[PDB]
mmCIF file of all heavy atoms in Angstrom:
data_model
loop_
_atom_site.group_PDB
_atom_site.id
_atom_site.type_symbol
_atom_site.label_atom_id
_atom_site.label_comp_id
_atom_site.label_asym_id
_atom_site.label_seq_id
_atom_site.Cartn_x
_atom_site.Cartn_y
_atom_site.Cartn_z
ATOM 1 N N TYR A 1 0.805 -1.213 0.000
ATOM 2 C CA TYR A 1 0.000 0.000 0.000
ATOM 3 C C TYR A 1 0.839 1.265 0.000
ATOM 4 O O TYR A 1 0.429 2.266 -0.594
ATOM 5 C CB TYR A 1 -0.939 0.028 1.210
ATOM 6 C CG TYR A 1 -1.952 1.149 1.159
ATOM 7 C CD1 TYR A 1 -3.139 1.007 0.457
ATOM 8 C CD2 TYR A 1 -1.718 2.352 1.808
ATOM 9 C CE1 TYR A 1 -4.065 2.027 0.405
ATOM 10 C CE2 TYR A 1 -2.639 3.380 1.762
ATOM 11 C CZ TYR A 1 -3.810 3.211 1.059
ATOM 12 O OH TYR A 1 -4.732 4.231 1.008
ATOM 13 N N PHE A 2 1.999 1.243 0.647
ATOM 14 C CA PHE A 2 2.903 2.386 0.701
ATOM 15 C C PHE A 2 4.186 2.002 -0.029
ATOM 16 O O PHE A 2 5.053 1.327 0.534
ATOM 17 C CB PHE A 2 3.184 2.792 2.143
ATOM 18 C CG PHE A 2 2.082 3.591 2.770
ATOM 19 C CD1 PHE A 2 1.590 3.254 4.016
ATOM 20 C CD2 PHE A 2 1.537 4.678 2.113
ATOM 21 C CE1 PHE A 2 0.575 3.984 4.595
ATOM 22 C CE2 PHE A 2 0.523 5.411 2.688
ATOM 23 C CZ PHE A 2 0.042 5.065 3.929
ATOM 24 N N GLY A 3 4.306 2.438 -1.279
ATOM 25 C CA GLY A 3 5.501 2.168 -2.053
ATOM 26 C C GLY A 3 6.623 3.140 -1.755
ATOM 27 O O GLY A 3 7.359 3.549 -2.658
ATOM 28 N N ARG A 4 6.765 3.515 -0.486
ATOM 29 C CA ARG A 4 7.787 4.455 -0.052
ATOM 30 C C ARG A 4 8.318 4.021 1.303
ATOM 31 O O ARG A 4 7.540 3.691 2.203
ATOM 32 C CB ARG A 4 7.232 5.879 0.035
ATOM 33 C CG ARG A 4 7.503 6.726 -1.191
ATOM 34 C CD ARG A 4 6.800 8.063 -1.086
ATOM 35 N NE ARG A 4 7.183 8.780 0.125
ATOM 36 C CZ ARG A 4 7.493 10.072 0.161
ATOM 37 N NH1 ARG A 4 7.465 10.793 -0.950
ATOM 38 N NH2 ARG A 4 7.830 10.642 1.308
ATOM 39 N N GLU A 5 9.643 4.028 1.449
ATOM 40 C CA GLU A 5 10.235 3.619 2.717
ATOM 41 C C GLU A 5 9.967 4.637 3.816
ATOM 42 O O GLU A 5 9.843 4.261 4.987
ATOM 43 C CB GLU A 5 11.736 3.394 2.551
ATOM 44 C CG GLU A 5 12.104 1.962 2.211
ATOM 45 C CD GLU A 5 11.550 0.967 3.211
ATOM 46 O OE1 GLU A 5 11.600 1.251 4.426
ATOM 47 O OE2 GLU A 5 11.058 -0.098 2.783
ATOM 48 N N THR A 6 9.885 5.920 3.463
ATOM 49 C CA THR A 6 9.560 6.942 4.452
ATOM 50 C C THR A 6 8.203 6.673 5.090
ATOM 51 O O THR A 6 8.067 6.690 6.319
ATOM 52 C CB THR A 6 9.582 8.325 3.805
ATOM 53 O OG1 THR A 6 10.766 8.464 3.009
ATOM 54 C CG2 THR A 6 9.565 9.407 4.870
ATOM 55 N N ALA A 7 7.185 6.421 4.264
ATOM 56 C CA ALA A 7 5.865 6.106 4.799
ATOM 57 C C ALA A 7 5.891 4.807 5.592
ATOM 58 O O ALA A 7 5.262 4.704 6.653
ATOM 59 C CB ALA A 7 4.845 6.025 3.666
ATOM 60 N N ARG A 8 6.623 3.807 5.095
ATOM 61 C CA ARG A 8 6.707 2.527 5.788
ATOM 62 C C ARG A 8 7.287 2.687 7.186
ATOM 63 O O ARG A 8 6.831 2.035 8.130
ATOM 64 C CB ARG A 8 7.543 1.539 4.976
ATOM 65 C CG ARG A 8 6.829 0.974 3.764
ATOM 66 C CD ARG A 8 7.719 0.015 2.997
ATOM 67 N NE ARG A 8 7.482 0.078 1.560
ATOM 68 C CZ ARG A 8 8.202 -0.581 0.660
ATOM 69 N NH1 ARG A 8 9.205 -1.354 1.054
ATOM 70 N NH2 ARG A 8 7.923 -0.469 -0.630
ATOM 71 N N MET A 9 8.308 3.527 7.339
ATOM 72 C CA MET A 9 8.890 3.693 8.664
ATOM 73 C C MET A 9 8.083 4.649 9.532
ATOM 74 O O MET A 9 8.086 4.506 10.758
ATOM 75 C CB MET A 9 10.339 4.172 8.559
ATOM 76 C CG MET A 9 10.508 5.565 7.991
ATOM 77 S SD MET A 9 10.390 6.899 9.205
ATOM 78 C CE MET A 9 11.510 6.317 10.474
ATOM 79 N N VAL A 10 7.385 5.616 8.933
ATOM 80 C CA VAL A 10 6.628 6.558 9.748
ATOM 81 C C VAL A 10 5.297 5.965 10.182
ATOM 82 O O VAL A 10 4.671 6.478 11.116
ATOM 83 C CB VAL A 10 6.408 7.885 8.999
ATOM 84 C CG1 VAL A 10 5.370 7.721 7.915
ATOM 85 C CG2 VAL A 10 6.024 9.000 9.955
ATOM 86 N N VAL A 11 4.855 4.881 9.545
ATOM 87 C CA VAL A 11 3.602 4.260 9.950
ATOM 88 C C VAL A 11 3.796 3.319 11.133
ATOM 89 O O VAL A 11 2.824 2.993 11.823
ATOM 90 C CB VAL A 11 2.968 3.527 8.755
ATOM 91 C CG1 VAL A 11 3.773 2.308 8.390
ATOM 92 C CG2 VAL A 11 1.534 3.155 9.041
ATOM 93 N N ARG A 12 5.030 2.893 11.409
ATOM 94 C CA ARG A 12 5.305 1.999 12.527
ATOM 95 C C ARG A 12 6.243 2.625 13.553
ATOM 96 O O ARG A 12 6.869 1.904 14.334
ATOM 97 C CB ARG A 12 5.879 0.672 12.027
ATOM 98 C CG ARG A 12 7.024 0.822 11.052
ATOM 99 C CD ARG A 12 7.251 -0.464 10.282
ATOM 100 N NE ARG A 12 8.123 -0.266 9.130
ATOM 101 C CZ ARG A 12 8.338 -1.184 8.194
ATOM 102 N NH1 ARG A 12 7.740 -2.364 8.275
ATOM 103 N NH2 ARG A 12 9.146 -0.923 7.178
ATOM 104 N N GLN A 13 6.355 3.951 13.568
ATOM 105 C CA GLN A 13 7.142 4.611 14.607
ATOM 106 C C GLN A 13 6.587 4.384 16.008
ATOM 107 O O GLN A 13 7.381 4.087 16.917
ATOM 108 C CB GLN A 13 7.269 6.106 14.296
ATOM 109 C CG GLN A 13 8.266 6.430 13.203
ATOM 110 C CD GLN A 13 8.533 7.914 13.083
ATOM 111 O OE1 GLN A 13 8.278 8.679 14.012
ATOM 112 N NE2 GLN A 13 9.053 8.331 11.935
ATOM 113 N N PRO A 14 5.278 4.518 16.271
ATOM 114 C CA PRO A 14 4.800 4.291 17.647
ATOM 115 C C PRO A 14 5.070 2.889 18.158
ATOM 116 O O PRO A 14 5.408 2.717 19.337
ATOM 117 C CB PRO A 14 3.295 4.576 17.546
ATOM 118 C CG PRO A 14 3.149 5.436 16.358
ATOM 119 C CD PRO A 14 4.181 4.964 15.392
ATOM 120 N N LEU A 15 4.927 1.877 17.301
ATOM 121 C CA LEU A 15 5.167 0.504 17.728
ATOM 122 C C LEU A 15 6.621 0.302 18.130
ATOM 123 O O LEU A 15 6.913 -0.250 19.196
ATOM 124 C CB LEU A 15 4.774 -0.464 16.614
ATOM 125 C CG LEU A 15 3.300 -0.474 16.217
ATOM 126 C CD1 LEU A 15 2.998 -1.678 15.345
ATOM 127 C CD2 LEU A 15 2.413 -0.467 17.447
ATOM 128 N N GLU A 16 7.551 0.741 17.280
ATOM 129 C CA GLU A 16 8.966 0.625 17.609
ATOM 130 C C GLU A 16 9.327 1.450 18.836
ATOM 131 O O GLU A 16 10.222 1.069 19.597
ATOM 132 C CB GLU A 16 9.818 1.047 16.414
ATOM 133 C CG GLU A 16 9.680 0.131 15.212
ATOM 134 C CD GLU A 16 10.412 0.653 13.993
ATOM 135 O OE1 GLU A 16 11.091 1.695 14.109
ATOM 136 O OE2 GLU A 16 10.309 0.023 12.920
ATOM 137 N N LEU A 17 8.647 2.578 19.046
ATOM 138 C CA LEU A 17 8.926 3.402 20.217
ATOM 139 C C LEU A 17 8.496 2.698 21.498
ATOM 140 O O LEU A 17 9.288 2.560 22.437
ATOM 141 C CB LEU A 17 8.229 4.753 20.090
ATOM 142 C CG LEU A 17 8.322 5.628 21.339
ATOM 143 C CD1 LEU A 17 9.724 6.189 21.492
ATOM 144 C CD2 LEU A 17 7.297 6.740 21.292
ATOM 145 N N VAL A 18 7.239 2.246 21.558
ATOM 146 C CA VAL A 18 6.755 1.538 22.742
ATOM 147 C C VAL A 18 7.221 0.094 22.788
ATOM 148 O O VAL A 18 6.881 -0.622 23.739
ATOM 149 C CB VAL A 18 5.218 1.563 22.829
ATOM 150 C CG1 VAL A 18 4.706 2.994 22.810
ATOM 151 C CG2 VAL A 18 4.612 0.752 21.700
ATOM 152 N N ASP A 19 7.977 -0.355 21.785
ATOM 153 C CA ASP A 19 8.542 -1.706 21.745
ATOM 154 C C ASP A 19 7.454 -2.776 21.771
ATOM 155 O O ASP A 19 7.563 -3.784 22.471
ATOM 156 C CB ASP A 19 9.547 -1.925 22.876
ATOM 157 C CG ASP A 19 10.886 -1.274 22.594
ATOM 158 O OD1 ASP A 19 11.359 -1.355 21.443
ATOM 159 O OD2 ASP A 19 11.465 -0.680 23.529
ATOM 160 N N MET A 20 6.387 -2.551 21.006
ATOM 161 C CA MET A 20 5.369 -3.567 20.744
ATOM 162 C C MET A 20 5.175 -3.600 19.232
ATOM 163 O O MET A 20 4.279 -2.949 18.692
ATOM 164 C CB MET A 20 4.073 -3.264 21.485
ATOM 165 C CG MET A 20 4.082 -3.686 22.942
ATOM 166 S SD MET A 20 2.456 -3.557 23.706
ATOM 167 C CE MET A 20 2.303 -1.782 23.864
ATOM 168 N N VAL A 21 6.017 -4.369 18.551
ATOM 169 C CA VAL A 21 5.976 -4.473 17.101
ATOM 170 C C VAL A 21 5.355 -5.788 16.652
ATOM 171 O O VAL A 21 4.599 -5.820 15.681
ATOM 172 C CB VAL A 21 7.394 -4.301 16.515
ATOM 173 C CG1 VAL A 21 7.358 -4.379 14.997
ATOM 174 C CG2 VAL A 21 7.997 -2.983 16.969
ATOM 175 N N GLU A 22 5.654 -6.875 17.357
ATOM 176 C CA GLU A 22 5.171 -8.200 16.997
ATOM 177 C C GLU A 22 4.112 -8.715 17.960
ATOM 178 O O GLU A 22 3.760 -9.898 17.906
ATOM 179 C CB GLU A 22 6.343 -9.181 16.929
ATOM 180 C CG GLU A 22 6.909 -9.593 18.285
ATOM 181 C CD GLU A 22 7.717 -8.498 18.961
ATOM 182 O OE1 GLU A 22 7.766 -7.366 18.437
ATOM 183 O OE2 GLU A 22 8.307 -8.776 20.027
ATOM 184 N N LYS A 23 3.592 -7.858 18.835
ATOM 185 C CA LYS A 23 2.555 -8.244 19.778
ATOM 186 C C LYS A 23 1.180 -7.715 19.399
ATOM 187 O O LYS A 23 0.209 -7.997 20.108
ATOM 188 C CB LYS A 23 2.914 -7.757 21.185
ATOM 189 C CG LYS A 23 3.747 -8.735 21.992
ATOM 190 C CD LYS A 23 5.218 -8.603 21.652
ATOM 191 C CE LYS A 23 5.746 -7.235 22.048
ATOM 192 N NZ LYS A 23 7.207 -7.104 21.800
ATOM 193 N N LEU A 24 1.066 -6.965 18.307
ATOM 194 C CA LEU A 24 -0.183 -6.299 17.974
ATOM 195 C C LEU A 24 -0.524 -6.495 16.505
ATOM 196 O O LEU A 24 0.321 -6.300 15.626
ATOM 197 C CB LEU A 24 -0.114 -4.800 18.285
ATOM 198 C CG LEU A 24 0.178 -4.424 19.736
ATOM 199 C CD1 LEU A 24 0.419 -2.933 19.859
ATOM 200 C CD2 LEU A 24 -0.955 -4.864 20.642
ATOM 201 N N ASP A 25 -1.771 -6.870 16.256
ATOM 202 C CA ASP A 25 -2.346 -6.920 14.923
ATOM 203 C C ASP A 25 -3.123 -5.635 14.680
ATOM 204 O O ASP A 25 -3.988 -5.261 15.485
ATOM 205 C CB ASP A 25 -3.261 -8.134 14.767
ATOM 206 C CG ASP A 25 -2.498 -9.439 14.796
ATOM 207 O OD1 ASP A 25 -1.355 -9.465 14.296
ATOM 208 O OD2 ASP A 25 -3.037 -10.436 15.320
ATOM 209 N N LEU A 26 -2.797 -4.968 13.577
ATOM 210 C CA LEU A 26 -3.349 -3.671 13.213
ATOM 211 C C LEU A 26 -4.230 -3.817 11.982
ATOM 212 O O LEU A 26 -3.794 -4.366 10.963
ATOM 213 C CB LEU A 26 -2.230 -2.667 12.931
ATOM 214 C CG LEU A 26 -1.244 -2.375 14.059
ATOM 215 C CD1 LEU A 26 -0.036 -3.285 13.977
ATOM 216 C CD2 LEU A 26 -0.810 -0.928 14.003
ATOM 217 N N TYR A 27 -5.460 -3.321 12.077
ATOM 218 C CA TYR A 27 -6.383 -3.262 10.953
ATOM 219 C C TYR A 27 -6.702 -1.797 10.696
ATOM 220 O O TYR A 27 -7.268 -1.124 11.563
ATOM 221 C CB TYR A 27 -7.654 -4.060 11.247
ATOM 222 C CG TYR A 27 -8.659 -4.064 10.123
ATOM 223 C CD1 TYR A 27 -8.540 -4.951 9.066
ATOM 224 C CD2 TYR A 27 -9.733 -3.186 10.124
ATOM 225 C CE1 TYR A 27 -9.457 -4.961 8.038
ATOM 226 C CE2 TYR A 27 -10.655 -3.189 9.099
ATOM 227 C CZ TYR A 27 -10.512 -4.079 8.059
ATOM 228 O OH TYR A 27 -11.430 -4.085 7.035
ATOM 229 N N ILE A 28 -6.336 -1.303 9.517
ATOM 230 C CA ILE A 28 -6.406 0.120 9.224
ATOM 231 C C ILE A 28 -7.350 0.342 8.056
ATOM 232 O O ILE A 28 -7.431 -0.470 7.128
ATOM 233 C CB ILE A 28 -5.017 0.709 8.898
ATOM 234 C CG1 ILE A 28 -3.937 0.084 9.780
ATOM 235 C CG2 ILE A 28 -5.027 2.214 9.072
ATOM 236 C CD1 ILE A 28 -4.094 0.383 11.237
ATOM 237 N N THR A 29 -8.070 1.457 8.108
ATOM 238 C CA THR A 29 -8.849 1.931 6.972
ATOM 239 C C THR A 29 -8.637 3.430 6.864
ATOM 240 O O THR A 29 -9.055 4.177 7.749
ATOM 241 C CB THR A 29 -10.335 1.608 7.129
ATOM 242 O OG1 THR A 29 -10.537 0.197 6.984
ATOM 243 C CG2 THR A 29 -11.150 2.340 6.079
ATOM 244 N N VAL A 30 -7.995 3.872 5.790
ATOM 245 C CA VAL A 30 -7.628 5.272 5.631
ATOM 246 C C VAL A 30 -8.248 5.800 4.347
ATOM 247 O O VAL A 30 -8.305 5.096 3.333
ATOM 248 C CB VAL A 30 -6.097 5.460 5.638
ATOM 249 C CG1 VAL A 30 -5.451 4.748 4.461
ATOM 250 C CG2 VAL A 30 -5.742 6.933 5.657
ATOM 251 N N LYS A 31 -8.739 7.036 4.403
ATOM 252 C CA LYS A 31 -9.401 7.667 3.272
ATOM 253 C C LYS A 31 -8.990 9.128 3.191
ATOM 254 O O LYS A 31 -8.850 9.800 4.215
ATOM 255 C CB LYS A 31 -10.925 7.565 3.390
ATOM 256 C CG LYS A 31 -11.490 6.199 3.051
ATOM 257 C CD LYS A 31 -12.967 6.284 2.710
ATOM 258 C CE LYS A 31 -13.760 6.915 3.843
ATOM 259 N NZ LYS A 31 -15.227 6.883 3.591
ATOM 260 N N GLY A 32 -8.796 9.610 1.970
ATOM 261 C CA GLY A 32 -8.516 11.009 1.736
ATOM 262 C C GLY A 32 -7.031 11.327 1.779
ATOM 263 O O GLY A 32 -6.222 10.606 2.354
ATOM 264 N N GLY A 33 -6.680 12.438 1.144
ATOM 265 C CA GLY A 33 -5.316 12.912 1.165
ATOM 266 C C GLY A 33 -4.401 12.120 0.252
ATOM 267 O O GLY A 33 -4.824 11.325 -0.588
ATOM 268 N N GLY A 34 -3.103 12.360 0.433
ATOM 269 C CA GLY A 34 -2.073 11.680 -0.311
ATOM 270 C C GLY A 34 -1.357 10.631 0.518
ATOM 271 O O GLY A 34 -1.792 10.243 1.602
ATOM 272 N N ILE A 35 -0.224 10.176 -0.017
ATOM 273 C CA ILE A 35 0.506 9.083 0.617
ATOM 274 C C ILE A 35 1.085 9.524 1.956
ATOM 275 O O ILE A 35 0.961 8.820 2.965
ATOM 276 C CB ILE A 35 1.589 8.545 -0.334
ATOM 277 C CG1 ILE A 35 2.406 9.695 -0.924
ATOM 278 C CG2 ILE A 35 0.958 7.728 -1.443
ATOM 279 C CD1 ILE A 35 3.469 9.249 -1.894
ATOM 280 N N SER A 36 1.711 10.702 1.994
ATOM 281 C CA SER A 36 2.272 11.186 3.251
ATOM 282 C C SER A 36 1.174 11.533 4.246
ATOM 283 O O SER A 36 1.301 11.248 5.443
ATOM 284 C CB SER A 36 3.165 12.394 2.997
ATOM 285 O OG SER A 36 4.212 12.070 2.100
ATOM 286 N N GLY A 37 0.094 12.154 3.772
ATOM 287 C CA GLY A 37 -1.021 12.442 4.656
ATOM 288 C C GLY A 37 -1.628 11.184 5.246
ATOM 289 O O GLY A 37 -1.932 11.130 6.438
ATOM 290 N N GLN A 38 -1.795 10.149 4.425
ATOM 291 C CA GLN A 38 -2.361 8.908 4.936
ATOM 292 C C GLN A 38 -1.408 8.234 5.912
ATOM 293 O O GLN A 38 -1.842 7.696 6.935
ATOM 294 C CB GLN A 38 -2.710 7.977 3.779
ATOM 295 C CG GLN A 38 -3.923 8.437 2.998
ATOM 296 C CD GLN A 38 -4.368 7.435 1.964
ATOM 297 O OE1 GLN A 38 -3.599 6.571 1.548
ATOM 298 N NE2 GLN A 38 -5.616 7.547 1.534
ATOM 299 N N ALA A 39 -0.105 8.268 5.624
ATOM 300 C CA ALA A 39 0.870 7.708 6.553
ATOM 301 C C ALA A 39 0.816 8.418 7.899
ATOM 302 O O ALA A 39 0.814 7.776 8.957
ATOM 303 C CB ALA A 39 2.270 7.793 5.950
ATOM 304 N N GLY A 40 0.753 9.750 7.880
ATOM 305 C CA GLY A 40 0.697 10.495 9.127
ATOM 306 C C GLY A 40 -0.598 10.271 9.884
ATOM 307 O O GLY A 40 -0.602 10.183 11.116
ATOM 308 N N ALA A 41 -1.714 10.168 9.160
ATOM 309 C CA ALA A 41 -2.985 9.888 9.815
ATOM 310 C C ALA A 41 -2.978 8.509 10.457
ATOM 311 O O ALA A 41 -3.489 8.334 11.568
ATOM 312 C CB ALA A 41 -4.132 10.008 8.813
ATOM 313 N N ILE A 42 -2.390 7.520 9.782
ATOM 314 C CA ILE A 42 -2.313 6.188 10.369
ATOM 315 C C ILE A 42 -1.391 6.191 11.580
ATOM 316 O O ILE A 42 -1.645 5.493 12.564
ATOM 317 C CB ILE A 42 -1.875 5.152 9.321
ATOM 318 C CG1 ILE A 42 -2.885 5.087 8.180
ATOM 319 C CG2 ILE A 42 -1.782 3.784 9.943
ATOM 320 C CD1 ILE A 42 -2.421 4.255 7.015
ATOM 321 N N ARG A 43 -0.313 6.977 11.538
ATOM 322 C CA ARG A 43 0.553 7.076 12.710
ATOM 323 C C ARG A 43 -0.198 7.666 13.896
ATOM 324 O O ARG A 43 -0.114 7.152 15.019
ATOM 325 C CB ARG A 43 1.787 7.918 12.395
ATOM 326 C CG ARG A 43 2.776 7.966 13.547
ATOM 327 C CD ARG A 43 3.973 8.840 13.238
ATOM 328 N NE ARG A 43 3.760 10.216 13.670
ATOM 329 C CZ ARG A 43 4.527 11.239 13.311
ATOM 330 N NH1 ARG A 43 5.566 11.042 12.512
ATOM 331 N NH2 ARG A 43 4.258 12.458 13.752
ATOM 332 N N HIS A 44 -0.935 8.754 13.664
ATOM 333 C CA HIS A 44 -1.723 9.363 14.732
ATOM 334 C C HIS A 44 -2.764 8.391 15.274
ATOM 335 O O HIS A 44 -2.977 8.304 16.490
ATOM 336 C CB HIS A 44 -2.387 10.640 14.220
ATOM 337 C CG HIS A 44 -3.110 11.414 15.278
ATOM 338 N ND1 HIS A 44 -4.313 12.045 15.046
ATOM 339 C CD2 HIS A 44 -2.797 11.666 16.570
ATOM 340 C CE1 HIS A 44 -4.712 12.647 16.151
ATOM 341 N NE2 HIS A 44 -3.809 12.433 17.091
ATOM 342 N N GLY A 45 -3.419 7.643 14.384
ATOM 343 C CA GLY A 45 -4.413 6.682 14.828
ATOM 344 C C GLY A 45 -3.815 5.543 15.629
ATOM 345 O O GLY A 45 -4.382 5.121 16.640
ATOM 346 N N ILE A 46 -2.674 5.016 15.181
ATOM 347 C CA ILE A 46 -1.979 3.981 15.939
ATOM 348 C C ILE A 46 -1.594 4.503 17.312
ATOM 349 O O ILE A 46 -1.705 3.792 18.316
ATOM 350 C CB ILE A 46 -0.750 3.480 15.162
ATOM 351 C CG1 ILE A 46 -1.188 2.668 13.947
ATOM 352 C CG2 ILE A 46 0.150 2.645 16.054
ATOM 353 C CD1 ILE A 46 -0.122 2.539 12.900
#
């Protein structure tokens, strides 16, 4: 869904920060904006 490494790393910053990367299953639905906007919205939602 994100053909960019910047978006890929910014979408999982909270998980790596709180050190819960492999303990949580995430189901996301994002609408509107562009790739960076959607990445940031998913980060805020996570």
